[PDB]
Design a protein around this ligand. Sequence first.
Ligand SMILES: COc1cc2c(cc1NS(=O)(=O)c1ccc(C#N)cc1)c(C)cc(=O)n2C
Length: 112
Amino acid sequence: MQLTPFLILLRKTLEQLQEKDTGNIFSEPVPLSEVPDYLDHIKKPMDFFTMKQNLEAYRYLNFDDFEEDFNLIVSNCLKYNAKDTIFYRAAVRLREQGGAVLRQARRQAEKM
Ligand SMILES: COc1cc2c(cc1NS(=O)(=O)c1ccc(C#N)cc1)c(C)cc(=O)n2C
């Protein structure tokens, strides 16, 4: 029963957020093989594959918690990376574009 309007809204919204990540930079966890110090800085890694995992395990009880996980993708990236990096620039753009997606989707999560 992923067939409830709240859960269909989260699935839709997650798709729309991944669409804004045009480089697929945030599609999967930051790889510790390529990035060995990541956990020295970042206490709670997050990425869209993890969010999708969470969604399907009914771990998102409300829209707030879903939105907090998206914000972690962005805030982690801005925290870890220098300003002059593809990653940081991507996160700034994702914050801007994804904030708008979330604005609209929250409107619908209220109506429930
Ligand atoms: C999911 O792949 C990554 C995501 C990353 C980071 C690194 C990777 N992987 S990587 O180190 O293999 C890599 C290095 C350079 C580019 C470019 N351009 C892309 C990936 C790094 C270094 C930081 C980061 O915030 N994110 C989101």
